[PDB]
Structure 1
């Protein structure tokens, strides 16, 4: 009973020290787990959502909401641990262009989620506000037959959840472009809206 939605309390500074209850180190210890356990939890996720949903579209939106609830957490944790706690630090750039948060994703997010850095990151020549984020080998979903793409939305559900909470609202879809020796390649394309673009249209 400290902060309700009803009032504000007034208590004096430089009073007595209160009790010590719960604390934890924010910086990561290096922890590893098998790929099989997270793959088993991932297929159990897709199995339960296959069980309790009717058609493909709202299944995809529910999986994207599942990814969203990791991404909105993950933004502040990765930026705070890339700024460096009780140790003396400061504050990163807190980047605000479009072309460097995607650089931040392709550099740090994919090398945080996985051992390897993300592969390629190109724009679209035919239209602006379309950005291609591509890998060669999806390590979330390498265990499903390749003709289904909807099970690939969870990771781009992260990316929308990484982007909308960072101040750039957008929308993502994913397709599979079988280019080269990689049969599954998994393009994720990011559709922004107009209302952000003219904002950076206003900023020269």
Structure 2
């Protein structure tokens, strides 16, 4: 079914089964590698990005693109495991609005990744296009001295690709603010665009 070729094929009156040349299970396996190993993986990745890139903002984008690579991928089978081989009962509801899908990061994205829950999902005071999630003690960047906050844009990239498939294009930033005795908690103050806010603003 090539782009150059047409949609042409042949009749159904034979059997191609199984011909899996490679098709397997896809279930939630558990192998649980050490945080030192993945921390070294992230470590030499950030070393490559400070090698090859000029200044602050382009490095921030050239970090968040990895999150945009695999955010779509984690979205669709995390939803296919949570809201649903595959002797399937059903697939449940999609994103209704913004407040179920940023509950869906809050419910089962962090507990898919980091075995806990980010502690709040605060709807903002002054506006509604801006939303803010704070992780309390970020797991994959706990060793980096976070005075530059440029090193946590893995996870701003990974949630932006959780919402760009969801139809909400969104400016996603991170800041870090020590509001509690919990130190080095990072706020992901996200935004949206006006238009799916106005698609929410048609009826709410």
CA displacement at 1:26 relative to structure 2 = 1.3
Aligned match of 2:13: 13
Any idea what SS the aligned residue of 1:88 has?
A: coil
TM-score (norm: length of structure 2): 0.93
Provide Cα deviations, 1:109-161, integer angstroms capped at 9, x if missing partner.
00001111221110110111111101110001011112110111111100101
Q: Distance in 1 between matches of 2:135 and 2:150?
A: 17
Alpha-carbon offset, residue 13 of structure 1: 5.2
Distance of aligned partners of 1:151 and 1:20 in 2 relative to their CA distance in 1, 3 Å threshold: closer
Q: What residue number does 1:116 align with?
A: 116
User: TM-score scaled to structure 1, two decimals?
Assistant: 0.93
CA-CA distance at 1:173 after TM superposition = 0.6
Shift of 1:27: 1.1
Change in Cα spacing, 1:15 to 1:200, as seen in structure 2 (3 Å) is: same
Offset at 1:15?
Answer: 4.3
**Could you list the runs of 4 or more consecutive aligned residues of structure 1 that deviate by over 6 angstroms after TM superposition?**
none
Q: How far apart are 1:73 and its partner, in Å?
A: 0.8
- Structure 1 residue runs of 5 or longer lacking an equivalent are none
| 1:44 corresponding residue in structure 2 | 44
Deviations 1:56-111 (A, max 9, x none): 11000011101111211111010111133431321111122000000010010000
Distance in 2, Cα, partners of 1:12 & 1:37: 50
Q: How big is the alpha-carbon RMSD for the aligned residues of Structure 1 and Structure 2?
A: 1.8
Aligned residues: 204
